[PDB]
Amino acid sequence: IGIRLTLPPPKVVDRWNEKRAMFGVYDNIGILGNFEKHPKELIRGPIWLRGWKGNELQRCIRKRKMVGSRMFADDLHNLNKRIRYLYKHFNRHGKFR
Amino acid sequence: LVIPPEKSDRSIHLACTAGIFDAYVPPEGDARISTERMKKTMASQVSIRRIKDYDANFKIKDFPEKAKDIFIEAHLCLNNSDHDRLHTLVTEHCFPDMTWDIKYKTVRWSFVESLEPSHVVQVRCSSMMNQGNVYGQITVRMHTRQTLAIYDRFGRLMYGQEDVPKDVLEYVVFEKQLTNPYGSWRMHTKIVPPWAPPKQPILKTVMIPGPQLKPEEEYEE
Amino acid sequence: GADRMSKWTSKRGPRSFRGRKGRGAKGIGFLTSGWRFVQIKEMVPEFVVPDLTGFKLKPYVSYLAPESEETPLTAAQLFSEAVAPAIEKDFKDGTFDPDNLEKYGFEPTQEGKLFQLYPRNFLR
Amino acid sequence: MPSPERLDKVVDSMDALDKVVQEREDALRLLQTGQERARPGAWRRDIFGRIIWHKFKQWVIPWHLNKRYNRKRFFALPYVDHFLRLEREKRARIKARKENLERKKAKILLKKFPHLAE
Amino acid sequence: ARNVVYPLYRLGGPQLRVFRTNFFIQLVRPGVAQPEDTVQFRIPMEMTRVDLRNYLEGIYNVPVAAVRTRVQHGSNKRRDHRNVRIKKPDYKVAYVQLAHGQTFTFPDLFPEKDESPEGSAADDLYSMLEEERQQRQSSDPRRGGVPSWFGL
Amino acid sequence: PLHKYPVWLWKRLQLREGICSRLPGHYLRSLEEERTPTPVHYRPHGAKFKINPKNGQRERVEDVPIPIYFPPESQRGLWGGEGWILGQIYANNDKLSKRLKKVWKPQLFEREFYSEILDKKFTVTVTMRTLDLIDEAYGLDFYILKTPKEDLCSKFGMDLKRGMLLRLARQDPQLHPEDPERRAAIYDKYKEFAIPEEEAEWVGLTLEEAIEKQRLLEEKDPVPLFKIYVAELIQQLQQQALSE
Amino acid sequence: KVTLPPHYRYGMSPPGSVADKRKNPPWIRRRPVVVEPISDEDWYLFCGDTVEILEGKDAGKQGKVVQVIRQRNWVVVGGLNTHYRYIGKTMDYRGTMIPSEAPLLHRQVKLVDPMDRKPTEIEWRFTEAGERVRVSTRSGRIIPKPEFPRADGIVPETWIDGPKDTSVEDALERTYVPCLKTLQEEVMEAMGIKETRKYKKVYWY
RNA sequence: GCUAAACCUAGCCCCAAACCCACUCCACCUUACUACCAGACAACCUUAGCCAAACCAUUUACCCAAAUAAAGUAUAGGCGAUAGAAAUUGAAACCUGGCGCAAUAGAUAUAGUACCGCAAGGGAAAGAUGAAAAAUUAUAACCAAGCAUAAUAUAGCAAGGACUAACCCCUAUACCUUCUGCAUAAUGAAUUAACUAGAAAUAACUUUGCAAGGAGAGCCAAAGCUAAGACCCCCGAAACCAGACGAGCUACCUAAGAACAGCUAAAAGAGCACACCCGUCUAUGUAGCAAAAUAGUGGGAAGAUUUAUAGGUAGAGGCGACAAACCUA
RNA sequence: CUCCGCAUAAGCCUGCGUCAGAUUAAAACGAACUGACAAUUAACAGCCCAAUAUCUACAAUCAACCAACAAGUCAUUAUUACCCUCACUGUCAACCCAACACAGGCAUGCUCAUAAGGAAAGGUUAAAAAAAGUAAAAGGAACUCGGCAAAUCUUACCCCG
RNA sequence: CUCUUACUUUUAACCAGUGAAAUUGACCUGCCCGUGAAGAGGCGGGCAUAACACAGCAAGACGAGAAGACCCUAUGGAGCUUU
Ligand code: MET
Ligand SMILES: [K+]
Ligand SMILES: [K+]
Ligand SMILES: [K+]
Ligand SMILES: [K+]
Ligand SMILES: [K+]
Ligand SMILES: [K+]
Ligand SMILES: [K+]
Ligand SMILES: [K+]
Ligand SMILES: [K+]
Ligand SMILES: [K+]
Ligand SMILES: [K+]
Ligand SMILES: [Mg+2]
Ligand SMILES: [Mg+2]
Ligand SMILES: [Mg+2]
Ligand SMILES: [Mg+2]
Ligand SMILES: [Mg+2]
Ligand SMILES: [Mg+2]
Ligand SMILES: [Mg+2]
Ligand SMILES: [Mg+2]
Ligand SMILES: [Mg+2]
Ligand SMILES: [Mg+2]
Ligand SMILES: [Mg+2]
Ligand SMILES: [Mg+2]
Ligand SMILES: [Mg+2]
Ligand SMILES: [Mg+2]
Ligand SMILES: [Mg+2]
Ligand SMILES: [Mg+2]
Ligand SMILES: [Mg+2]
Ligand SMILES: [Mg+2]
Ligand SMILES: [Mg+2]
Ligand SMILES: [Mg+2]
Ligand SMILES: [Mg+2]
Ligand SMILES: [Mg+2]
Ligand SMILES: [Mg+2]
Ligand SMILES: [Mg+2]
Ligand SMILES: [Mg+2]
Ligand SMILES: [Mg+2]
Ligand SMILES: [Mg+2]
Ligand SMILES: [Mg+2]
Ligand SMILES: [Mg+2]
Ligand SMILES: [Mg+2]
Ligand SMILES: [Mg+2]
Ligand SMILES: [Mg+2]
Ligand SMILES: [Mg+2]
Ligand SMILES: [Mg+2]
Ligand SMILES: [Mg+2]
Ligand SMILES: [Mg+2]
Ligand SMILES: [Mg+2]
Ligand SMILES: [Mg+2]
Ligand SMILES: [Mg+2]
Ligand SMILES: [Mg+2]
Ligand SMILES: [Mg+2]
Ligand SMILES: [Mg+2]
Ligand SMILES: [Mg+2]
Ligand SMILES: [Mg+2]
Ligand SMILES: [Mg+2]
Ligand SMILES: [Mg+2]
Ligand SMILES: [Mg+2]
Ligand SMILES: [Mg+2]
Ligand SMILES: [Mg+2]
Ligand SMILES: [Mg+2]
Ligand SMILES: [Mg+2]
Ligand SMILES: [Mg+2]
Ligand SMILES: [Mg+2]
Ligand SMILES: [Mg+2]
Ligand SMILES: [Mg+2]
Ligand SMILES: [Mg+2]
Ligand SMILES: [Mg+2]
Ligand SMILES: [Mg+2]
Ligand SMILES: [Mg+2]
Ligand SMILES: [Mg+2]
Ligand SMILES: [Mg+2]
Ligand SMILES: [Mg+2]
Ligand SMILES: [Mg+2]
Ligand SMILES: [Mg+2]
Ligand SMILES: [Mg+2]
Ligand SMILES: [Mg+2]
Ligand SMILES: [Mg+2]
Ligand SMILES: [Mg+2]
Ligand SMILES: [Mg+2]
Ligand SMILES: [Mg+2]
């Protein structure tokens, strides 16, 4: 029980597909391109996470500030509660003061 | 299961008939040898001509040798339970007869000698375009020595002996689907004459129970 | 304990509820004093059944019938087949005026007609 | 039932008869009145804030004198605005799942049949 | 007619007329004993007993003396695999009594004599199943289970 | 997921679709404009920069309006921009005491005003501020026309403005029909507020009122297809004759 | 008719049949079968077509297609790719063994050239008249669509009109004269029904 | 040997992109889903509180529409906890992706269905053959606990040292938690499978880069600066507040109904005593027939009686012949 | 045995009718389980009414004597308008509220012991303990907190209200 | 009650059918004395000791049940009263 009786289907990984072959290209666009474009401009994803890093509280604060007006009512309510809980956890609870 | 779902364009494709178009009754006392004759020959010739229409390169004289090879190879498939090859040698009417009773038994069948050359006794064909298909049945007389030794599920001797051949006189009926381009001559059934001698007795003893009478019922002579 | 999912029909409720709910059948009159029902003859629908004697059309059509393309009837086609020949005949004769549009079949108002197209006041 | 397909043919014949007759009446109604529907109606916003096509019913007194008709509410109060947004966002989530799932199926399909690149 | 808006009638107005009625009725065999002149119908819910009297006389030219109708409650006890109640549709039962002393008996729509065609059938599949079953014989007890295919 | 547009922009998007698209441009621009009301319940600083007394530094200052609640009954009068003040107070003006709820209500008076343009007297509920504004404007008619919409704070006041603007726009002769000289004198007095009649009809109307008015203007019976098909048939026959 | 479940698995038995209901009860939920999408115009296999089997025990053999299942890209060739099963089995009788065809994918069969009985690839092309037909790639020969019996089991040539079948002359007779009158108005004139009472105006809201 | 076990899909999550959605006929605000009759009833109105200040009473972050920076600075504050700008500065922006989940996961979802509640509301469980089932005598097997094949022989945390030998001999006071200290007769645990609990700044340290400079504007700098690595759990109250839903039970009331044999006295908030209402005492029952009953014995039974139907009073309240009663166990 | 029973109201909604099913009913092959087919037919009951003005002091109780207080369920007229007909809906059951095929709850009419409706014992044995009854020598509250319980059916007094 | 007894029914026990619940660390689950977190089937010294059902009993397993309601503690609540 809890373990499969047959081998799973084999994993076929194409190490030389277009995505892996051209991975990392243009990462030095600033260095080799007269600094016209920063490498952080290649990042694709959420508009509040392009070229920016932070903990859970900082991400929640930043997302609410940038796209809070575009969020759904239920999604926004959960985000507001998450910030309240994270504010109490980080600023009031922990081993170190 | 008797009939598929109604109102379907697709229909079951049968590869053989269910029986013999005209049963060939062998003459009495034929084993001792080992006007009407012309009428039977003329009827056979007409059916041969229709067979030669679908297959121009067909000879009646070569059939008994071809029939002998099919008969030997079909029974040799029972020894090793080679059902895949057996379907190509016997028809769908003959396959259940050969294999149903030996599924959990070991069969050791062998061919020793041919006492008398095989003779074609009857060649006949079905009515033209029964369902768009025309079938031709050829009956071959075989008088050969064979050895049979059947073992039960536990490997114990059940019928026959492995080293004593005996004379066998049987009339094997073959069938081919003329309309099918990929059809071939395959064993269809066997004809058992009423005057055929009884087979060898089995080894074990069998009890035949009497009627099972309810308490209200009574036994009668 | 009540079944909310079941359809609410006239078989449920007290005596007052059961007698007030109906099954969708249209009324054919009204109730006067003493609970006496007065059936209006005009409110009762009348079945206009034609004479079928000597009728050559049967419920089914023989399969030896040529296939024909489906061309739904539109207002433009109806106008051309019914009104265009009348207007063209008068146009060539030189006697055509907008005042005589009622001659060609135009109805300015549906009021005063037994069967009014809009709002519809007749059954199927 | 002996030959059940006879009933289907009759229903289709009568449905076609309704269609042909309705087309003649619809075409005639457009020529004489220009209305696209025989039964009058109007677009109304119900008490729940939804836009609905209210079919008009026949009465013997004007609408302002109708006690039962004037108890209905064909307007939405401000407290219904939030529920309209929640229902709108509910439809957005349902449509987003449907569109995203379709892209997942196509990617799975290409794995099974790699020759469909073209 | 059903699923239509009946034109409203005001005093002194025209007669209400229906030209292509969509009311469909089916003659049904009664489940209990009925008088010889009583004919039972299943009619739509929107159909009143007044309409059925005009329906039969107008279309079938059947003289009608009295009509009585009732509403039958379809069963709502069945449960599917989801434990969801399945509602058998409710139907209205109408009883019609003939006028001029006429009597009606429900005919036998499936006579046994007509259901048996004297003409033979030439189905290859049906014939093959029947022929093989008769041709093949049962096992002989004295053989003791030994296969009978072999001629030896 | 995320909305394509922010929620607060949904109202403005609705003005670009539906019947609101076909509203007059001059009316729509009036709704978009949101001027700051004249301060009533708070004293503006009057300067953009003030020197902070403590650090002696120049600090930017801003006027934050006090939120004002206008009861629905205020729309039937002329309160002059006043309204209820819903707020909190500290007991004995001490921040260490309790924070209590306090509501300040204007003192309402019933007064009768005569409008020269409308030639009618109205019994309007007003405050003492409304009297001062009318006195500073030298008449009710001047006060209604001069005061902007955001400062009137009254639906009745905007309705009075529309009535006066319509008469000035039309040079309506119903004002003193038997005294043409007197009628021209009053119109000459308020000629500076004259606007085209098309724009005057939409002054003071709410969004719902404007939509209903626009719907009535656009409400017309559909043209029967018989008349349309006649025009095409007649035109095509004439073109055929030219080719022959 | 029957609203099939979203992931119903089509099989050899037609949907809604007795066998299908037992195999596919209303509560069954199996893994969907990944089927390569083929457009209706791209599909080129029809009932009665002669195709050659490419894979299986009957590789290289040619037969006639008897059934096509578009939901599975299946073609059934009569008497080819067949396994044997017992039919009509009872408690006493072992049953009758019959060959049973197994479905073949569209990629496992190849249409044959009418001139030379060999498998060939085809493409859909339009003739001069504008009809869309199948053209062999290598030989450029038109492959006609096979004549298959209609699904309703009716032969127009071997058809006799019954007591309730309208004749061709009566069915195609045009008795409709266009006019600006409704069906109700024409019937009143036809049957001579006279109505002088006028319909009162009613309030719609 | 059974019971079971195993599976890969259904779909889902987070983003990008893009601004969604209403009506065949018929029915639907009255008791919704009800063909057909005198309306004139009509929307607006500061959130509170938990919580933090180790009590609490002023006070205690909550998208308000440009990423960054100015800056956690000015400033505010039981000048405590904590709150916190602006001028100014000024960038990028190619939907069709995944070091996301794979049936106790991922949405609650096969479904807001079954089921539960008068109502508001709460809210599931699960599926698995194959190319073909028109191949069903098919797709072998081995794997938890629980059993069966196969009950048991002096003696003892069940084991260890061993031994020719299972036991007999010798040695040995289960585990976790909690405590000065537990074999403790302190806590938790029948057992199996799955699920279930350490999130981050300030400096400092370590290892690279460059160096009086470091850093891809801001910032730091008397060897600094930039970048990386590395430290901060889970379940549980009684409560408080806001907005809804509840008087079909019960408390009392309103409208209009119903019941009360016989005997005594004949006048009766009178007596005896059925129906009926109540529940004094005893036994039985205590996972019961019953989340308050049964049997007997009792109180009342023409009255301040009992009772059917519809309506009313709603939680900062109602209602109360005050029992802190009763307001859906 | 008969605690009932029959019917209406209320509630429930096809929930022991037929056929085909051997699925179960706290046991059990009939069916309350499954599928299909049947059914409850209006006279009873529900669903009512043109306008305006106007009228309506004197209970009920066998309503007659009699005596009441708590002072009571039942009524029109005038003028105008109005010629028309029998629709629609409820109708079944062994049934509802209590998680149950609950010793519980449940309005009215009639029967007042039955014409209607029902079965306390699966079979056996006849131990203890326990439960429900009957009978008892002599004594008769010596029991016990107390005459609790049972039996019999009675006297006097006190406290509180 | 002295002072209990007899019989019947239910229960009971046995046979057949159907088939719960609290409980349960593992148990190969004795007595005496002593000891010990102070009251031992499990530790020390002795004694006893083939195995395993069924029916009774209620001295013990600090028996089961309910995170003691008594008491105290908490900068935990709540109702009520007030100069
Ligand atoms: C002392 O009396 C203590 N056991 C409290 C008794 S009442 C719960
Ligand atoms: K912390
Ligand atoms: K523990
Ligand atoms: K503890
Ligand atoms: K101890
Ligand atoms: K202890
Ligand atoms: K304890
Ligand atoms: K009970
Ligand atoms: K109430
Ligand atoms: K029921
Ligand atoms: K005795
Ligand atoms: K004990
Ligand atoms: Mg419910
Ligand atoms: Mg959904
Ligand atoms: Mg009826
Ligand atoms: Mg609806
Ligand atoms: Mg605090
Ligand atoms: Mg405290
Ligand atoms: Mg300070
Ligand atoms: Mg401090
Ligand atoms: Mg799930
Ligand atoms: Mg879904
Ligand atoms: Mg195991
Ligand atoms: Mg030992
Ligand atoms: Mg030891
Ligand atoms: Mg201690
Ligand atoms: Mg110790
Ligand atoms: Mg112990
Ligand atoms: Mg312990
Ligand atoms: Mg403890
Ligand atoms: Mg447990
Ligand atoms: Mg950390
Ligand atoms: Mg760290
Ligand atoms: Mg816990
Ligand atoms: Mg508080
Ligand atoms: Mg509150
Ligand atoms: Mg009540
Ligand atoms: Mg009252
Ligand atoms: Mg009495
Ligand atoms: Mg009394
Ligand atoms: Mg009671
Ligand atoms: Mg009482
Ligand atoms: Mg008494
Ligand atoms: Mg309320
Ligand atoms: Mg009371
Ligand atoms: Mg008291
Ligand atoms: Mg007290
Ligand atoms: Mg009854
Ligand atoms: Mg009833
Ligand atoms: Mg049934
Ligand atoms: Mg009925
Ligand atoms: Mg009646
Ligand atoms: Mg009845
Ligand atoms: Mg209960
Ligand atoms: Mg009961
Ligand atoms: Mg009886
Ligand atoms: Mg017994
Ligand atoms: Mg005893
Ligand atoms: Mg006793
Ligand atoms: Mg006694
Ligand atoms: Mg005695
Ligand atoms: Mg005494
Ligand atoms: Mg004593
Ligand atoms: Mg004593
Ligand atoms: Mg006593
Ligand atoms: Mg005393
Ligand atoms: Mg007293
Ligand atoms: Mg016992
Ligand atoms: Mg248990
Ligand atoms: Mg447990
Ligand atoms: Mg032992
Ligand atoms: Mg022992
Ligand atoms: Mg001791
Ligand atoms: Mg010892
Ligand atoms: Mg024992
Ligand atoms: Mg205990
Ligand atoms: Mg104890
Ligand atoms: Mg405790
Ligand atoms: Mg206490
Ligand atoms: Mg304390
Ligand atoms: Mg403390
Ligand atoms: Mg507190």
Q: How many CB atoms lie within 10 A of CB B139?
A: 25
The answer to whether the beta carbons of residues E39 and E98 sit under 8 Å apart is: yes
Nucleotides of chain I touched by protein CB (<7 A)? 9-15, 17, 34-42, 45-50, 84-91, 96-98
The answer to whether the beta carbons of residues G205 and D56 sit under 8 Å apart is: yes
Minimal-distance CA residue of chain D relative to E9: D60
Asked whether the beta carbons of residue C78 and residue D33 sit closer than 8 angstroms, the reply is: no
Asked whether the beta carbons of residue E81 and residue G184 sit closer than 8 angstroms, the reply is: no
Domain of E57 in residue numbering reads as 1-152
Q: Which nucleotide is nearest to C44 (CA to C1')?
A: I87
Residue G37 makes CB contacts below 8 A (sequence gap 6+) with: D109, D116
Q: How many CB atoms lie within 10 A of CB B14?
A: 22
**Solved how?**
cryo-EM
**Sign of the four-CA dihedral G36, G41, G46, G51:** negative
Minimal-distance CA residue of chain A relative to D83: A73
R_g of chain B, CA atoms, integer Å? 21
Amino acid identity of residue E116, one-letter, is S
User: Which phi and psi angles does G9 have, rounded to 5°?
Assistant: -95, 110
Contacts across the B-G interface (CB distance below 8 Å): 54
Asked whether the beta carbons of residue E129 and residue G96 sit closer than 8 angstroms, the reply is: yes
Chain D residues with CB within 8 Å of chain F CB: 30-35, 85, 92-93, 96
| Closest alpha carbon to B99 in G90, E150, G79 | E150
Using the 8-state DSSP alphabet, how is residue E57 labeled? I
In a domain, G56, yes or no: yes
Cα angle for residues G148, G151, G153 (degrees, 5° grid): 95
In a domain, G77, yes or no: yes
B13 vs G19, G61, G101: nearest CB:
G101
Residue C31: CB less than 7 A from any atom in strand I: yes
For residues A22 and C30, give the distance between their C-alpha atoms in angstroms, rounded to a whole number: 86
Which chains, if any, share at least 3 CB pairs under 8 A with chain G?
A: B, C, D, E
User: Distance, angstroms, CA E79 to C1' H286?
Assistant: 40
For residues F202 and F209, give the distance between their C-alpha atoms in angstroms, rounded to a whole number: 9
The alpha carbon of C67 is separated from its chain's Cα centroid by a whole number of angstroms, namely 30
Residue C48: CB less than 7 A from any atom in strand I: no
Q: Do chains C and D touch (3 or more CB pairs under 8 A)?
A: yes
HEC readout, chain C:
CCCCCCCCCCCCCCHHHHHHCCCCCCCCEEEECCCEEEECCCCCCEECCCCCCCCCCCCEECCCCCCCCCCCCCHHHHHHHHCHHHHHHHHHHCCCCHHHHHHHCCCCCCCCCCCCCCCCCCCC
Query: Is some CB atom of chain D closer than 8 A to the CB atom of E114?
Result: no
Alpha-carbon gap: E123 to the closest alpha carbon of chain G (Å): 15
Contacts of F3 in chain D (CB under 8 A): 92
Domain of A63 in residue numbering reads as 1-96
DSSP annotation string for F175-191: SSTT-HHHHHHHHHHTG
Contacts of C59 in chain D (CB under 8 A): 9-10, 13
DSSP annotation string for B4-57: --SS-S-----SS-SS-SS---PPTTHHHH--HHHHHHHHHHHHHHHHHHH-SS
Residue that has been written with the tokens 């290409």 in this structure: D110
Q: Where are the domains of chain B?
A: 1-191
Residue E93: CB less than 7 A from any atom in strand I: yes
Minimal-distance CA residue of chain F relative to A47: F2
Residue A45 makes CB contacts below 8 A (sequence gap 6+) with: none
For residues G22 and G19, give the distance between their C-alpha atoms in angstroms, rounded to a whole number: 5
User: Distance, angstroms, CA A31 to C1' H313?
Assistant: 82
Residue that has been written with the tokens 């008994």 in this structure: B64
Give the total number of structural domains in chain G. 1
In a domain, G18, yes or no: yes
Asked whether the beta carbons of residue C73 and residue D10 sit closer than 8 angstroms, the reply is: no
E10 vs D18, D39, D60: nearest CB:
D60
**Sign of the four-CA dihedral B192, B198, B204, B207:** positive
D10 CA to centre of ligand 20 in angstroms: 92
The answer to whether the beta carbons of residues F121 and F112 sit under 8 Å apart is: yes
Residue D31: CB less than 7 A from any atom in strand H: no
The answer to whether the beta carbons of residues B167 and B121 sit under 8 Å apart is: no
Do β-strands C60-61 and G165-166 pair in parallel, antiparallel, or remain unpaired?
parallel
User: Which phi and psi angles does C123 have, rounded to 5°?
Assistant: -85, 175
CATH number, position E132:
3.30.70.330
The answer to whether the beta carbons of residues G68 and G76 sit under 8 Å apart is: yes
Q: How many CB atoms lie within 10 A of CB F85?
A: 17
C85 CA to centre of ligand 57 in angstroms: 103
Q: How many CB atoms lie within 10 A of CB B135?
A: 23
Give the total number of structural domains in chain A. 1
C10 CA to centre of ligand 9 in angstroms: 25
Phi-psi map region of E47: left, alpha, beta (phi>0 left; psi -120 to 50 alpha) = beta
Angle formed by the axes of helices C75-82 and F225-243, to 10°? 60
Q: Which nucleotide is nearest to G10 (CA to C1')?
A: H132
Query: Is some CB atom of chain G closer than 8 A to the CB atom of C75?
Result: no
Residue C16 makes CB contacts below 8 A (sequence gap 6+) with: none
Asked whether the beta carbons of residue A74 and residue D82 sit closer than 8 angstroms, the reply is: no
Task: Tell me the helices (H) and strands (E) count for chain B, helix number first.
Answer: 5, 5
Is B153 exposed, middle or buried (CB count within 10 Å of its CB: 0-12, 13-18, 19+)? exposed
Query: Is some CB atom of chain G closer than 8 A to the CB atom of E143?
Result: no
Chain D residues with CB within 8 Å of chain E CB: 17-18, 21, 39, 58-60
Phi-psi map region of C91: left, alpha, beta (phi>0 left; psi -120 to 50 alpha) = alpha
Is F122 exposed, middle or buried (CB count within 10 Å of its CB: 0-12, 13-18, 19+)? middle
| Closest alpha carbon to B93 in B23, B193, B186 | B186
Alpha-carbon gap: F138 to the closest alpha carbon of chain D (Å): 41
G199 vs C63, C66, C116: nearest CB:
C116
CATH class of the domain comprising B1-191: alpha beta
Query: Is some CB atom of chain C closer than 8 A to the CB atom of E69?
Result: no
Using the 8-state DSSP alphabet, how is residue B99 labeled? H
B140 CA to centre of ligand 68 in angstroms: 85
The answer to whether the beta carbons of residues G70 and G41 sit under 8 Å apart is: no
